[PDB]
Amino acid sequence: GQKINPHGFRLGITTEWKSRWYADKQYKDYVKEDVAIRKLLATGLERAGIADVEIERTRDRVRVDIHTARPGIVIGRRGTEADRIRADLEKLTGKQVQLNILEVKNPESQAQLVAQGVAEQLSNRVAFRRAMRKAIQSAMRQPNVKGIRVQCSGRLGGAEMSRSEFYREGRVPLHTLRADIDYGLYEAKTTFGRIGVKVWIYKGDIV
């Protein structure tokens, strides 16, 4: 175990909590319903890139905000997708649950989306070098990106021997607290097993 999770390193300094509420007696069941919501949204939607899911609660009403790179896919033009998600979130005993669907401004500057794309390419047929090079170039093309590192490991290329490979470009100062490191991990489903892709993206520092 080498490196701690970058989000947890800067949780109180740079990054922010993804769940915002206060509970004293009802902390445990709040946590249970939050994880249920998260797993439901993870399983239901896979096509549009789900970069982040926030949950806010206040007594009866529950506010869940999600960021996706393809908002049109997850939303029903007549509300059909909205109807389905609303109903099955009511079924999660959430009382009144309301949704704010959002869109990320720069999908290529978001680590989770980058890892999702790399893993999706890896799954079907693509050689891993191609995927890493393409992701690195696309991210560095963005204005705020100051450094990106992509690393994936496993039975790469269907080999019998597991391997770890990584390429870096620019600056990725993992030990610096003020530097904001966007971290994204997502597992690629291949016929020979499971391939894990980790992405670190560095875009300046916040003081």
Interacting residues with other proteins (CB under 8 A): 1, 4-5, 7-9, 11-12, 15-22, 27-29, 31-32, 34-36, 38-39, 56-58, 63
In this complex, which beta carbon is closest to RNA, that of residue 124 or of residue 191? 191
Rounded least distance, CB 121 to RNA, Å: 19
Cβ(113)–Cβ(184) below 8 Å: yes
35 binds, among RNA, other proteins, none (CB under 5 to 8 A by kind): other proteins
Q: Which residues contact 131 (CB under 8 A, 6 or more apart)?
A: 118, 121, 122, 152
**Cβ nearer to other proteins, comparing 42 with 126:** 42
- Residue 131: name the closest of 47, 139, 5, 163 by CA: 139
Residue 32 vs 189, nearer CB to other proteins = 32
Closest separation between CB of residue 101 and RNA, Å? 28
Cα separation, 93 vs 33, whole angstroms? 8
Nearer to other proteins, 131 or 182 (CB): 182
- Binding region for RNA (CB under 7 A): 2-4, 9, 24-25, 161, 164, 166, 174-175, 177, 187, 191-194
Closest approach, Cβ 34 to RNA, in A, equals 17
Q: Is 32 left (phi over 0), alpha (psi -120 to 50) or beta?
A: alpha
191 binds, among other proteins, RNA, none (CB under 5 to 8 A by kind): RNA
Strands 96-103 and 61-68, bridge-based pairing = parallel
In angstroms, what is the minimal distance from the CB of 185 to other proteins?
A: 10
Pick the closer one to RNA by CB: 35 or 73. 35
Tell me whether residue 71 or residue 196 sits nearer to RNA (CB atom).
Answer: 196
Q: Looking up tokens 């690629």, which residue turns up? A: 188
φ, ψ of residue 62 to 5 degrees: the values are: -125, 130
**Partner from RNA, other proteins, none contacting 70, C-beta within 5 to 8 A by type:** none
Q: Are strands 96-103 and 147-154 parallel, antiparallel or unpaired?
A: unpaired
- Measured from the CB of residue 18, what is the shortest distance to other proteins in angstroms? 5
Give the integer Cα–Cα distance in Å for 86 and 161: 45
Contacts of the segment 38-45: beta carbons below 8 A, 24+ positions apart: 40/88, 40/89, 40/92, 41/66, 44/85, 45/73, 45/74
90 touches, from other proteins, RNA, none (C-beta below 5 to 8 Å by class) = none
